[PDB]
Amino acid sequence: DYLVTEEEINLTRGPSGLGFNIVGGTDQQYVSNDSGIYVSRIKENGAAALDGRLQEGDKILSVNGQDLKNLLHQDAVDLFRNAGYAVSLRVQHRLQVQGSAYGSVKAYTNFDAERDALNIETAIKTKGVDEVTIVNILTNRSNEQRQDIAFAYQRRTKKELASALKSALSGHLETVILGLLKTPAQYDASELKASMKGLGTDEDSLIEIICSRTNQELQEINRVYKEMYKTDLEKDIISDTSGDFRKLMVALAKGRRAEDGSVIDYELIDQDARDLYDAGVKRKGTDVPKWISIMTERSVPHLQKVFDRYKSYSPYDMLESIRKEVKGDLENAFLNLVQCIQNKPLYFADRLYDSMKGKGTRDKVLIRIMVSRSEVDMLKIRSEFKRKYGKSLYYYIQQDTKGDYQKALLYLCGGDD
Amino acid sequence: PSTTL
Ligand SMILES: [Ca+2]
Ligand SMILES: [Ca+2]
Ligand SMILES: [Ca+2]
Ligand SMILES: [Ca+2]
């Protein structure tokens, strides 16, 4: 999913300074228990920007040959402030090279935003509305292509595409289409905002989003949430949850989980496993903060190994331990989180099965998963679904939904099996 | 707390 490259960058400090900011240190950890020094910002027309090599999110390994390993924040700052005007940096980059490789919806190769916008306008305005054409277009374009369509639509009609579709569509189909027209962060932010109703908060939707999104996704959600609603996501969580459930949700929503490490820390894997047992099944009652700290701070690959080592000590695996130890929203949040850590595509496959298996449909959950995972890991979700349930995700959608709504969801599924 | 350099 990611690539790591190292590189020596040589900067000359000009009248505007080096032109970048840093975070980190043993006392100001960027992510949980990470003491590294990271570039947080790069100023324009500064030395780093005009050089081009340094990038935000870079880890700074050394300055003028001095290693930035396990330093106080101030000691790293002092090494920069006491450097000369010729500054040599060894830096580590982190590059994401996955994209939509495991998504079911790909960018349409022969895309033409103006053509799509015109054909959707025509479909909206034909007598009776041509929902088939609207579904065929919008579910067979990537999210960013949909944004270009919406821009071209507004330019030619002087009306917003989402407003026009609110009038042209109804029912679950409208929910699907309007969801697809939001960016991933806008969609997640709006779903979280809608779930927070004070004492009527939709904990299940809160849990699903907060427990399953990564650091990078949550950082974008936090930024977009603030722009859209003029309040920080964390503040709305605090005012709409309570108890240990609130502390868990707040911790997860920060999106500061330890990032994937190069070295597997076997000693910490074992110690975390013992701690989880000692805090839960081994004792009367539960030390919930210890569970929260471990499960929100460690990297996902680390915790995967922790949960297996936990079985060496405990007669019960982590999931059945949660069921035995806690109840209510807190129990449901831990259960979702542990499933997300162990196998995220299987987590979504099981949530999709649950949304359809019984009487009627939990359309809110079904739609949200099909919209939000279609460009992420729907191909992996489909593989886990077929392996566990024998029939395909496509088949269950077909049995539980009908009409143009069904057709849109099957396009988001992408194919059978 | 970020530090400008
Ligand atoms: Ca129609
Ligand atoms: Ca409507
Ligand atoms: Ca116990
Ligand atoms: Ca059903």
Author numbering:
A (entry chain A): 6 to 422
B (entry chain B): 731 to 735
Relevant lines from the article:
The human proteome comprises 266 human PDZ (PSD95/DLG1/ZO1) domains 16 and about 4000 putative PBMs, defining a network of one million potential interactions. PBMs are mostly (though not exclusively) C-terminal, with their COO- implicated in binding, and are classified based on position −2, being respectively Ser/Thr, hydrophobic or acidic in classes 1, 2, and 3 17,18. PDZ-PBM interactions are rather transient and promiscuous. Viral proteins bearing functional PBMs are found notably in HPV and HTLV oncoviruses as well as in HBV, WNV and coronaviruses including MERS or SARS-CoV213,15,23–26.
In another example, the profile and the logo of SYNJ2BP indicate that this PDZ-domain is highly promiscuous, with however a mild preference for E-T-x-V-COO- motifs and a moderate bias for basic residues at upstream (−4 and −5) positions. RPS6KA1 PBM does not fully match SYNJ2BP’s logo and thus binds only weakly to SYNJ2BP (pKd = 3.82). Upon phosphorylation at p-3, RPS6KA1 gains a negative charge at this position, thereby getting closer to SYNJ2BP’s logo. Accordingly, the p-3 phosphorylated variant RPS6KA1 gains affinity to SYNJ2BP (pKd = 4.48; ΔpKd = 0.66), as previously published. The structure of p-3 phosphorylated RPS6KA1 bound to SYNJ2BP explains this enhanced binding by revealing a network of specific phosphoryl-PDZ contacts. The p-3 phosphorylated RPS6KA1 PBM matches better to SYNJ2BP logo, with acidic phospho-Ser at p-3 contacting two residues of SYNJ2BP β2 and β3 strands in the complex. Nonetheless, p-3 phosphorylated RPS6KA1 binds only mildly to SYNJ2BP as compared to SYNJ2BP’s strongest binder in our interactome, the oncoviral PBM of HTLV1 Tax1 (pKd = 6.04). Yet Tax1 matches better than phosphorylated RPS6KA1 to SYNJ2BP’s logo thanks to a basic p-4 Arg and a p0 Val (Pro and Leu in RPS6KA1, respectively). Accordingly, in the crystal structures, p-4 Arg of Tax1 establishes favorable H-bonds with a Gln from the α2 helix of SYNJ2BP PDZ, and the Val-bound state of SYNJ2BP PDZ is more compact than its Leu-bound state, due to displacement of the carboxylate-binding GLGF loop likely driven by the larger side-chain of Leu. The carboxylate-binding loop of SYNJ2BP is shifted in the phosphorylated RPS6KA1-bound complex, most likely related to unfavorable Val → Leu substitution at p0 of RPS6KA1 PBM.
